[PDB]
Design a binder for this molecule. Sequence first.
Ligand code: IHP
Ligand code: IHP
Ligand code: K
Ligand code: K
Ligand code: K
Ligand code: K
Ligand code: ZN
Ligand code: ZN
Lengths: 64, 168, 168, 369, 369
Amino acid sequence: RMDCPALPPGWKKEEVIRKSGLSAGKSDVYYFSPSGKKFRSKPQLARYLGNTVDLSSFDFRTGK
Amino acid sequence: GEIRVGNRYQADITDLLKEGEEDGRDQSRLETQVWEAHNPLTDKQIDQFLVVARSVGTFARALDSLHMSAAAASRDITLFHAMDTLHKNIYDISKAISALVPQGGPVLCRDEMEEWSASEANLFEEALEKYGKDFTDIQQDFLPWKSLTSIIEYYYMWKTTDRYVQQK
Amino acid sequence: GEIRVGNRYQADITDLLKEGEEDGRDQSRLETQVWEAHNPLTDKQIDQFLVVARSVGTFARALDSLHMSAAAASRDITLFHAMDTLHKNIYDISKAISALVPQGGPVLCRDEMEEWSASEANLFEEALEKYGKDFTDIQQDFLPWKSLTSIIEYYYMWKTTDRYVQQK
Amino acid sequence: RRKVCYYYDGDVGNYYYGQGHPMKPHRIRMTHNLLLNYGLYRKMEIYRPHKANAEEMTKYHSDDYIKFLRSIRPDNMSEYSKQMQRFNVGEDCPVFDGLFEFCQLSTGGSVASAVKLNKQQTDIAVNWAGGLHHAKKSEASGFCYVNDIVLAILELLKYHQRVLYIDIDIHHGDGVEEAFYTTDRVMTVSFHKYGEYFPGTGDLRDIGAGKGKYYAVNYPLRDGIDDESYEAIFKPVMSKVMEMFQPSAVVLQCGSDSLSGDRLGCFNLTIKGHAKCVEFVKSFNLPMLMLGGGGYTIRNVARCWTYETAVALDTEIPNELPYNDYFEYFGPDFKLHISPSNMTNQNTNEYLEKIKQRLFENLRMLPHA
Amino acid sequence: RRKVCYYYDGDVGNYYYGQGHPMKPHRIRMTHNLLLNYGLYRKMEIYRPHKANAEEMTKYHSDDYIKFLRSIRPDNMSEYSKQMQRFNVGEDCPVFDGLFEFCQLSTGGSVASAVKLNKQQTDIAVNWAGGLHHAKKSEASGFCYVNDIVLAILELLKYHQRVLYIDIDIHHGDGVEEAFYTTDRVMTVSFHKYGEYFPGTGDLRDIGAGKGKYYAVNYPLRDGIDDESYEAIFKPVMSKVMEMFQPSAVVLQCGSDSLSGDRLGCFNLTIKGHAKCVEFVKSFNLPMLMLGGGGYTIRNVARCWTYETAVALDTEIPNELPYNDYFEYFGPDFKLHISPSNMTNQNTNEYLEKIKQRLFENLRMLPHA
Ligand SMILES: O=P(O)(O)O[C@H]1[C@H](OP(=O)(O)O)[C@@H](OP(=O)(O)O)[C@H](OP(=O)(O)O)[C@@H](OP(=O)(O)O)[C@H]1OP(=O)(O)O
Ligand SMILES: O=P(O)(O)O[C@H]1[C@H](OP(=O)(O)O)[C@@H](OP(=O)(O)O)[C@H](OP(=O)(O)O)[C@@H](OP(=O)(O)O)[C@H]1OP(=O)(O)O
Ligand SMILES: [K+]
Ligand SMILES: [K+]
Ligand SMILES: [K+]
Ligand SMILES: [K+]
Ligand SMILES: [Zn+2]
Ligand SMILES: [Zn+2]
C-alpha cells in the first residue's frame, strides 16, 4: 500500500499481480481511502470524492 | 487555453551590460569540465586506450564467464571512466595508464546491473511482476536498502536483459 | 687420466694488441640487445606495464575459463614479450602500449603448452607412456608435423601439469 | 567548423516521473550513451553542470514558487495540498522523489551554456536535459517545473540585444512566449499542432502585446505534416525572420515529439527532416543554444538528438547504431533513422500558404531599410 | 655497483642431449625464467648472442674437428662412425639434433661477453650456457664439444696480460688447463673431487709445464666437503693467487655439480657456500666473466645460478621462489636455498692443510717484490 501523493492525504494505491488463469501475470490496481475503504475503478473513485478533487487528467493505473 | 499579461506573467527583462560593466559570474560554480575536444591525442590512441581500459577491467574481475567478464568490462560505465581517466591525467597516456593500475592492481567499474547480488536481482523480478513499475513501493517493500535512483538505473539496464522476454 | 703437451693439445696464445692496433670485431655480428638496464622508467611503471600486458592478453583470448585465460596470459612468454615491447619502443610507455594493441586489436602470445591442440596433447601422452623420453621417435611416429624443439619445450612445460601426477 | 559544448549530469537519466507517466528523463542518458559510442562525445567539449540554486531560478520565478519546489516532497505531500493546487502540481505534473534536483540540473545546463555563449568561448552549446518550455512564472505546466529557457535567455540578453527563440516541439512554446510577451528584444517563433491539443494557445492571431506585438510568430498546424511540407514552410519563414529580426544569438528548442510515431505527438517527421531545421539554423552562423524538450517514443528521441548533435559537429554518422548498454532497445533493425508513416497529411498546400502569407505580413511590420 | 651483462638465447633450453642423459640444457631456461620473476632480469643488460661460426671456433680447435661437428648429424651417423671414434662422440657425449647449433650459442655467449669486457663497457658478464670445460682441441669430452672458455680467454689476452681462470665445478677443468698448460699468461686454479672420478687429472702434483710450470694450481678433494671447509680453503688460496699472479681479468666457472644432492656430484655445498666464492672473487673488483658448467639436479642448478646472478648485482632476493612457468618443479617447499646433508665430510683438517701448504709453496715460486 503506497501513498498516492496526487490524491488527498492518507490515500493509498496498491497493484496486485494475477497469479493464475486467463490473465495470469496482468495486474489490477486498487485505491484505499484514509479509513481503508477499497476502490477498484476511476468512476467509483470519482463518485466517492465528488468535487473535492478533479480527476479528469488522473491516470488510475499509475496514480499520476 | 489563454495567454496572460502582467507583472505576474512576464519576466523582468535583463538590461544589456555597459561596455565597462562585467556580468559577475563564477564559472567554476556553474560547470566542471570532463573532456577537452582538442587533445594532443589521435583517434587511434584514444581508441587504443579504450581497448586497454577494457582489458584491465576484464583482468580485474578475473582476480575476484570469459566472454561474460569481457562484455561486462566493455559496458559504457567502464568506457566513460576511461575517458575521464584520460582527461584527469591531462591526456598523458603513460600517466593515465598508472591511474588504471594504481599499485600494480587493476580497477573495477560495475554498473548497478552487474553490481547487484543474485538475490537482489531476484527480489527485483518479484517486485516488478507484483507492483509493476511503481519503484518507490518496489524499494519500500522489496529492496529498502537500495537507493531509489539505483533501482531506476537498474530497471532500464534490466529491460535489455536476454533472459528478459516480455515480447513475442 | 693424463694431461698432454704439444702442438696438437695447447692453444696458440693470442698476442697482446699494440696501443695502436685494434681488435677488429664487429659487435653487431656478435650480439643484439634485448633490455637496457638504465631506463627512464621506474620499477613501478614496468610492473604496471606488465599488468597491462597481461590484461590485453586475457582480453585477446576472450575474443577467440576466466581464471584459466588470465593464468594463460600471465605465463612467462607474455611477460618476456612485454619486456621486449618496451625495449623495442625505446621505453616509451605510450608508444609501447600501441604496439600491444596495433590497430585496436590485442596481441596473443601462446607457448607450446597452450598452443597445441587437445588431440596433439593426447598424442603426446600416448607417445611418452609408450616410448618414454625418446623425443625423436615420439615425433617420427606420433607428432611428425611438429618440430623436435617444440616438442622439447612442450615436454618440460607439461611436466608441471596439474592432471600430471607421476609422484605419490 | 563550429565548436560545440555538451552539458550532461549522469544523475538525470535516473530521476523518474512516475508509473504510467510519458515523460521519461532516461532518454537523455540513452542519447549520451549513443554519442559516446558513435564517437561524437570525443569531438566536443563535455561539461558537468553544477546545480542551479534558488538564487538564479528566482531571477524569473516567484520567490515562493521556487520556495515551494525546494520544500515539497512525497513525504509532506498531504500537508501541502493547499499550495499544490495553486501551483499545478498533480494529474500530469506529478510530485516525485528528486524533482527539485532534476530541475537544478536542467536549469544549470542551460544557464552554464548561455554564459559560455556570452563569454564567447563556444559557437554552439547543447543541453538535452533542458528545453522545458511550458513552465510559467508562478506555476508548473506540461511536465515543466522550471523554465530553463527563459533563464537562459535572460542571461543572453546581458550581451545580446536581440535573442531569437525557435521552437520545433509539436506543442506550442507558451512558457517562453508568455515570459517575453511584452518585449521587442526577444522574438518567439513556434510551429505546432493546433485544435484540440495542448496548451490551447499559439494560433495565427497570437502576435504578442505592447512592445512585444509583431514579435511573437506562430505557425498553427493540423495532423500528419511531412518533412517536405515542414521544410517548405520553415526555411521561408525563418529566412524572413532573420532578415527582419536580425538576432545576435539563437536558441533552438529541438522538441522531438514532432517526430513520427510519437506517443503523444501526431506529426509525420523523420529525424532527417527534423534535423534539416537544426542544420538550416546553424547555417546562419550565430551563437546557438540547442535544447531538447518533448519526445515520448524514447527510442526515437535518442536517435534524433544523437543525430542532431552530429549536425552541430557537421560530422557524418552511419545508420548502423553502435553497440551500447541500451542497444537492445532499438527494435529488430538497430538503425539510426526512421521513415515516415502512411499517415495522411491534413495540411493542404492551400492552408499552409494562407498562413505563411499572414506571417510574412506580420514580419514586414518590423523596422528595416 | 658493478654493471652486469647477461647473455641468453631462448633456443638453448630446447636442445636435448638424449634419453637417459644427465646433461639437460633446460636448466638454463629455468634460471632465465627465475631471473625474470625475481626481478633481476630487469636490472641487467640482456643480450641475445648471435651464432659463433666455425671461423672463431677454429681459433683454438682443429679445422677438421669443427668441420666434423658442422657436418655430423643423426642422419649420417652410421656413415661417419670412423671419425666418431677419433673424436670421442658417443657413450657419454651423444650425437643429437641441433648439437652444432647448441655449441654456437654457448660459444657465442662467452665470446661476445669477452669482447664486451675488453671493450670495457661492462664490469661483469654472465653466460650460464657456457662454461663447458672438458672439451679438447681435437676431441669432445665430458659432455663438452666446444671449449667456449678457452676461446673466451683467447680474446681477453688481446687486452689482458694475465688472465686468471677459476673453476669451482666438482670435475677438474682439464680442458682449460691443457689448452694453456705451457703459458704463463693464464693461471688455471681448480678445486675438485679426485680419486675414482672424472677426468682422472688434476692431482696435487699437476703443476703445468715449460713456461706454464707453477701456473696450474689444483686442489684435490675427497667426498662430503662442507661450505665451512670449502670457504676456509678457497679464500686463503685465492688471496695468495691474486697476491702472486696479479691478474687483470678473471674468468670464474661456476659449476653447480659441486652442490649437495647432485646426481653426479658427491660434495656437500649449499647455494650459500657455493656463492660465497663468487662474492669473494667479485670483491677483487676485476673484469669478471661468470660461466656455468656442470650441474645435474637441475632444480638446484636453477636455484644456484639465479642466486649467484643476484650476487653479481649485489641485490637481495627472498627465499620465497617467485611463481614461474616451472614453479611446480621446486618440491613441496618452493624455496631458493638448500641445506647440507648428514653426509660425512672425509676432508679432515689435516688433509686440507697438507695440500694447502704445498700450494702456498708452489705459488711462492712466482715473481713478486
Ligand atoms: O518502462 P517505462 O518507462 O514505464 O515505459 C514502458 C516501455 O516503453 P519504452 O520502452 O518506450 O520506455 C514499454 O516498452 P517495452 O518495454 O515493451 O519495449 C511499453 O510497452 P510497449 O512499448 O509495448 O507499449 C510500456 O507501455 P505499457 O505500460 O502501455 O505496456 C511503457 O510503460 P508506460 O506506458 O508506463 O510508459
Ligand atoms: O625429464 P628428464 O630430463 O629425462 O629428467 C627426468 C626427471 O628429472 P628432472 O626433473 O631433474 O629433470 C625426473 O624427475 P621428476 O620428473 O620425477 O620430477 C626423474 O625422476 P626422479 O626425480 O624421480 O628420479 C627422471 O629420472 P628416472 O628416469 O631415473 O626416473 C629423469 O629422467 P632421466 O633419469 O632420464 O634424466
Ligand atoms: K513548437
Ligand atoms: K515577444
Ligand atoms: K673444478
Ligand atoms: K698454465
Ligand atoms: Zn511537446
Ligand atoms: Zn662437473
